[PDB]
Write a protein that binds this DNA or RNA. Sequence first.
RNA 1: CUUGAGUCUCGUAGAGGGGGGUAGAAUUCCAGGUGUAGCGGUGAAAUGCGUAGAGAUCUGGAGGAAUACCGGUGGCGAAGGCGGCCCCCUGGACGAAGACUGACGCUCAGGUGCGAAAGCGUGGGGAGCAAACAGGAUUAGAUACCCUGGUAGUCCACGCCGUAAACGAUGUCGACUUGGAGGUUGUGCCCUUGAGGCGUGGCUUCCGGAGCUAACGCGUUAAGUCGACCGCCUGGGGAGUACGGCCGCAAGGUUAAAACUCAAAUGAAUUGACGGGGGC
Lengths: 106, 88, 117, 65
Amino acid sequence: MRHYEIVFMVHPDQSEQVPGMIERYTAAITGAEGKIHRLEDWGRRQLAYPINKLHKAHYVLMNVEAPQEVIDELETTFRFNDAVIRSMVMRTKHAVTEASPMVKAK
Amino acid sequence: SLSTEATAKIVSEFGRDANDTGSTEVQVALLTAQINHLQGHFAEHKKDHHSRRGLLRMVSQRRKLLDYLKRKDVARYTQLIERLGLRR
Amino acid sequence: RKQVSDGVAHIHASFNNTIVTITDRQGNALGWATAGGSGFRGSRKSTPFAAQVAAERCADAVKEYGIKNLEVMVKGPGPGRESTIRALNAAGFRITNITDVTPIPHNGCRPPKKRRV
Amino acid sequence: FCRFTAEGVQEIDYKDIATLKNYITESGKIVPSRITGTRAKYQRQLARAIKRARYLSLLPYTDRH
RNA sequence: CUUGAGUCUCGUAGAGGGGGGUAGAAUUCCAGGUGUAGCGGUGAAAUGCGUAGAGAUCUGGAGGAAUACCGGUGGCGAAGGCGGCCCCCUGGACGAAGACUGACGCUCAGGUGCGAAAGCGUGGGGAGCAAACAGGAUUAGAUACCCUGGUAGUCCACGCCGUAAACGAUGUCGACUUGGAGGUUGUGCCCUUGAGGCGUGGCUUCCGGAGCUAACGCGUUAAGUCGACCGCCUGGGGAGUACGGCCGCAAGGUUAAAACUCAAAUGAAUUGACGGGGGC
Ligand SMILES: [Mg+2]
Ligand SMILES: [Mg+2]
Ligand SMILES: [Mg+2]
Ligand SMILES: [Mg+2]
Ligand SMILES: [Mg+2]
Ligand SMILES: [Mg+2]
Ligand SMILES: [Mg+2]
Ligand SMILES: [Mg+2]
Ligand SMILES: [Mg+2]
Ligand SMILES: [Mg+2]
Ligand SMILES: [Mg+2]
Ligand SMILES: [Mg+2]
Ligand SMILES: [Mg+2]
Ligand SMILES: [Mg+2]
Ligand SMILES: [Mg+2]
Ligand SMILES: [Mg+2]
Ligand SMILES: [Mg+2]
Ligand SMILES: [Mg+2]
Ligand SMILES: [Mg+2]
Ligand SMILES: [Mg+2]
Ligand SMILES: [Mg+2]
Ligand SMILES: [Mg+2]
Ligand SMILES: [Mg+2]
Ligand SMILES: [Mg+2]
Ligand SMILES: [Mg+2]
Ligand SMILES: [Mg+2]
Ligand SMILES: [Mg+2]
Ligand SMILES: [Mg+2]
Ligand SMILES: [Mg+2]
Ligand SMILES: [Mg+2]
């Protein structure tokens, strides 16, 4: 199992979904023995450029450590969802459990 | 390549000692493991020549090591080609 | 019909022609006139003086809406485009800002082979 | 000039937008190292971080948006 | 036996390769909105486009191909080559400190594989570009040349083709031989450490000593001093052609002559000309 830093932006109107979407997702991860090393929400946040005629989406960061199979299932979940306007998962060399220039400054 | 656990296990399996990682048998076994692994890879990525180069290199190196072993002491060579199922 | 008093101008400026057209924050165009739409042809239609006269005959052609300020979307390095923008500056418009909107592809398409001599 | 070596960050992460916008023109384009004096390794790290940020719409690709 | 060659442990850098996603510019098209007579092109126009509403501008969509800035003769790769971002699979190199094997090495005819672009087959796809072709500018004649179009191709899959100034015009491997300046990537020690100072590797660029070379130049990354092995050359033209063999669907590739003909052909450098060029 490897480390990952999943960051996704969800349609701001659906911001009532995040406190349950993160629960379901980290539930899948921990059930896959995935150790959530960090979870952060930065709420709504202004967009640098429009996305599908839309601004100020809702950002969520989460550093996890899980096997690639379940995170592939997770990104498929992302794809089939619609509220999450755009996600990005990227591997990382270790587990990072620290602050972030978003929560540290906002 | 090979996970550290796989290499450690194979070293234990063919190594005369614990830390004997240079013996011809453990080298042949490691190369054989990696070749058998890469079989599945190249069964799918047929156009990936750049790594097939390294695969062919390690195949030829296994061949050279086997020949050295066989002409040094044929007994161990036979035992090894039996454990790994080679020269066939 | 209506009033804007601070519009936006667009000078599409090729090396062979220079067209100028204004709208108001919305892209709904108001008045257009070309350097070639003024009897000029050949190299004559590609002169900064043609830009002067096109600026004039757009300003007057839209003065019915009576605008007083301007954004300018200069696009394409037409020969001497400061000419027409300051012509409009003198035409009774406090130009707010200029913007080079010359479209730049990120290696998107293969350009045609240029002139050979 | 030799900034990140004086600071010693192990990796210029894409999240620190505050420390990125000073390596970016007002047009959004990346500024070369020969102007900012950053070491080439950290210049590469900066380029990758900036591109990731542009993807996440933390930074803009250009001003034309 | 361990110094060559390998294996293991810890790491580092990277447009190395394969697969799949995804992003934002831009081009073209479509949809409408605003909004009319020009647009486009050129030596100048014409062909063309525009009253069926273009062009310009705004919004939406579709689709293909390529990845500005970073970007650096910077990096990676055996070479050809490799450039958004993310993931998956995977090759190589390098460093530190050890441990392990114990000559397991170098080279290589034949052989096998890889091999830019164009090209060929089959099926896709097709925005831009564009051989051929078409039209406009058009002379005893249209070809020149320029425009406006524009198919193959360019793209993908799978097969062939196997050639390039495929170049560093420099075969691979090893040892040795004064320096200086860089770039890049490690790493050890250390000043109070950051910065910064001493080291010590790998790769890479440019000067230049001895030496070498016909000279130009090369010069620790040799074209120096040596060793091992392979490839290749023997005047120019005829000719990388003919014949034959092999290979290929084909285009052709590969191997490779002779007759005849000339008394040269060629390399580097030197001195002048070369004014419808510069400067004084
Ligand atoms: Mg290996
Ligand atoms: Mg790669
Ligand atoms: Mg677009
Ligand atoms: Mg329209
Ligand atoms: Mg290299
Ligand atoms: Mg690797
Ligand atoms: Mg021993
Ligand atoms: Mg051969
Ligand atoms: Mg082949
Ligand atoms: Mg091709
Ligand atoms: Mg074809
Ligand atoms: Mg076809
Ligand atoms: Mg064309
Ligand atoms: Mg043409
Ligand atoms: Mg013709
Ligand atoms: Mg021609
Ligand atoms: Mg092919
Ligand atoms: Mg050849
Ligand atoms: Mg080349
Ligand atoms: Mg040659
Ligand atoms: Mg050598
Ligand atoms: Mg060094
Ligand atoms: Mg020199
Ligand atoms: Mg050197
Ligand atoms: Mg030599
Ligand atoms: Mg010589
Ligand atoms: Mg002869
Ligand atoms: Mg022939
Ligand atoms: Mg023949
Ligand atoms: Mg035949």
